[PDB]
């Protein structure tokens, strides 16, 4: 576990907003984060596009199963760790690689589940805008502990602990020390 952040009652949200002229658009996505919580319904990280574009990426725990759902333009594609239980209070890490429609999701050292959609799928996540951690405004606030958020060469928590000018924190998001 890297820079651990603790979420308490009520929760909160931490937002990393890219500069307007340096917003990235990438074919492939790489997410990785460790966590420890007992919540049955929560959202860990939400990645949004700019105004108008409907491209999105979301990671959430529903009914005790962690999963990632993304909209790349054609339709929503979701991959979930169905044959497991994750809200048992123990620390578990999750990794996710994306290539167009193809999505590989792994948790702990268990075998990687793969999703290979059929038909023509768009492959471009257009004009990333903000990284949201907490999911409180979405509708399912997250309470627990998070660590080591890695996103395509951007360690969100590591630079957030450095108090960079492009990160804003609100709520019960506290730093473990």
């Amino acid at each position: 576990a890297g820079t651990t952040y603790i979420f308490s009652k009520g929760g909160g949200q931490i937002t990393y907003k890219w500069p307007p002229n340096d917003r990235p658009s990438t074919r492939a996505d790489r997410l990785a984060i460790g966590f420890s919580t007992v919540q049955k319904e929560a959202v860990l990280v939400r990645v949004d596009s700019s105004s108008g574009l409907g491209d999105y990426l979301e990671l959430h725990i529903h009914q005790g199963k962690i999963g990632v759902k993304f909209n790349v333009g054609t339709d929503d594609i979701a991959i979930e760790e169905s044959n497991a239980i994750i809200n048992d209070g123990k620390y578990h890490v999750v990794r996710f690689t994306r290539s167009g429609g193809n999505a590989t999701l792994q948790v702990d050292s268990w075998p990687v589940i793969e999703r290979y959609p059929a038909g023509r799928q768009l492959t471009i996540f257009n004009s990333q805008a903000t990284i949201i951690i907490g999911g409180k405004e979405q509708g399912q606030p997250f309470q627990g502990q998070l660590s080591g958020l890695y996103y395509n060469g951007l360690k969100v928590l590591n630079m957030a602990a450095e108090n960079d000018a492009n990160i804003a924190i609100v709520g019960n998001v506290r730093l473990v020390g």
């Binding site: 002229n21 658009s25 074919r27 574009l53 333009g73 768009l122 471009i124 257009n126 004009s127």
Partner: protein
């Protein structure tokens, strides 16, 4: 002094040629350094690979041979730049040592941080051109940017395809991508920055630039793009029926086996000059051998691809000239009057028949595009019909596609800068009524006026031309350095701020002797071509 720079495959010797002008420093030229294996034998009609390391030092001083082509043939004159068509005899001097092995590039290096790189994608059409024609030793010295001009497979040997797996096609685009990869992984030794690689080009070469944006092959190779007088959504940008022309060439060359693999294998045996001299004529306002939609380089047709945001947010600079279809009116350009009504009707009817050709309705489209492109305040002027015909061709082929691609790029939050060149050097043989034609912006970008008239540009150059050239390359080099044509280097050009191209507010900048930032370039006619003609 002959400086030696070690690349990743060996060491190359350059030169230190000096410039005539005073304010420009010395330039180092590594002319002719290879970037891929020669596609001579069984590697013909195959994608290029990495070069072969040479033990020792390679003398890189002489201009490399040009790719096989045929200038004195049946070239499509409508799409070629005006200065290339007018001075065809002078332009044929550069293409004199044509050989099948032509995969070489030339670097021009000057002498606030690490110097950027500007690759030039030449080619008025896909059958002609060579990187030796443009000397980028002036732009490199002025803007302190390493300028790289390449040579890639052209015409028959470069863009032949059948749709099957026997010959996928777009070997020229693969050669360009290989050159970009070589620059990315080898420019650090020459002093360039492998993270600020702009690519720019005019004419159909600019189309390649657009076709290099929607391709996933060139993902991280380059960062910016300056597409001037070119698009990937025009009529002569992509070849949609390669099989017909390939089979026609195969029949005219000697072997026309029914199975495509056997025909391709036979074609690989013919020497490079027999299958180029063949006269395969495409339909008017189209191309015979060019980029082909296959799935590897171009996944789908470029028009559909850019609608659904299939690009990776490249800083982009589009532009057009005032009247580029100067060769649309050439049969009626040496007359005392302009175009008669019986000739205007005939020209518009031929235009509709050649381009649209809709059996459902054409007696309505012809009349409405006839009414739209005529001045009713001077309906019987006669001379004011050449202008309207030239505007018609320019609007349909060059202005509307440029505006459409600028809007589609800006709709996904990517910096888009639109320019409209309006000045033209006074040519000896060009009509007085003619305005800035296709390819007349290339002399200014490469700084020809500050050096003097050449064989390719026999023009008078005054002080205004020198000032405009300096300003144009200042803008281009600022864009190459920082992606914003106003930030790094201070500049009626002093008090003009070039703004982005928003879809809602289509601000552009009007290059010329009277610069100004305007709000909509030919909104009426562009909206006619984009939003009304599709309804009819």
């Amino acid at each position: 002094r002959f400086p030696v720079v070690n690349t990743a495959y060996g060491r190359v010797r350059g030169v230190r040629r000096e410039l005539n002008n005073e304010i420009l420093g010395p330039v180092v030229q590594f002319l002719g350094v290879p970037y891929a294996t020669p596609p001579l034998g069984a590697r013909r009609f195959q994608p290029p690979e990495a070069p072969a390391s040479w033990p020792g030092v390679r003398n890189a001083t002489t201009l490399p041979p040009a790719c096989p082509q045929n200038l004195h043939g049946a070239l499509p004159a409508i799409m070629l730049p005006v200065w290339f068509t007018d001075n065809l005899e002078a332009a044929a001097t550069y293409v004199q040592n044509q050989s099948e092995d032509c995969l070489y590039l030339n670097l021009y290096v000057p002498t606030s941080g690490k110097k950027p790189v500007m690759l030039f994608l030449h080619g008025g059409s896909y059958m002609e051109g060579t990187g030796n024609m443009f000397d980028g030793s002036v732009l490199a010295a002025y803007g302190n940017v390493i300028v790289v001009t390449l040579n890639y497979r052209l015409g028959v040997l470069g863009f032949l395809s059948t749709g099957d797996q026997a010959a996928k096609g777009n070997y020229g685009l693969l050669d360009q991508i290989q050159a970009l990869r070589w620059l990315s992984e080898n420019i650090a030794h020459f002093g360039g920055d492998p993270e600020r690689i702009t690519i720019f080009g005019s004419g159909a070469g600019a189309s390649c630039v657009n076709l290099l944006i929607l391709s996933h092959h060139s993902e991280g190779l380059f960062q910016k793009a300056i597409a001037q007088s070119g698009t990937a959504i025009s009529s002569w940008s992509v070849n949609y029926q390669p099989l017909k022309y390939t089979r026609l060439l195969a029949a005219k060359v000697g072997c026309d086996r029914e199975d495509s693999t056997e025909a391709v294998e036979c074609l690989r045996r013919k020497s490079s000059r027999e299958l180029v001299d063949q006269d395969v004529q495409p339909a008017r306002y189209h191309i015979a051998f060019g980029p082909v939609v296959d799935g590897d380089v171009v996944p789908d047709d470029p028009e559909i691809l850019m609608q659904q945001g299939e690009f990776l947010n490249y800083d982009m600079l589009i532009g057009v000239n005032q009247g580029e279809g100067l060769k649309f009116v050439e049969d009626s350009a040496e007359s005392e009057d302009g175009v008669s009504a019986s000739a205007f009707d005939f020209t518009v009817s031929n235009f509709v028949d050649n381009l649209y050709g809709y059996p459902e309705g054409k007696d309505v489209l012809r009349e409405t595009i006839k009414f739209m492109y005529t001045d009713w305040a001077d309906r019987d002027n006669g001379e004011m019909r050449r202008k309207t015909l030239l505007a018609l061709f320019t609007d349909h082929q060059w202005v509307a596609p440029a505006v459409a691609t600028a809007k589609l790029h800006a709709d996904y939050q990517s910096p888009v800068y639109f320019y409209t060149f309006y000045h033209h050097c006074q040519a000896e043989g060009r009509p007085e009524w003619a305005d800035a034609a296709h390819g007349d912006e290339l002399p200014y970008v490469f700084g020809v006026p500050m050096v003097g008239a050449t064989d390719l540009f026999p023009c008078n150059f005054s002080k205004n031309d020198v000032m405009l050239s300096a300003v144009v390359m200042t803008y281009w080099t600022n864009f190459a350095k920082t992606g914003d044509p106003n930030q790094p280097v201070p500049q009626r050009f002093e008090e003009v701020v070039w703004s982005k191209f928003n879809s809602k507010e289509k601000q552009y900048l009007h290059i010329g002797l009277k610069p100004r930032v305007r709000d909509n370039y030919r909104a009426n006619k562009v909206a006619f071509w984009l939003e009304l003609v599709p309804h009819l």
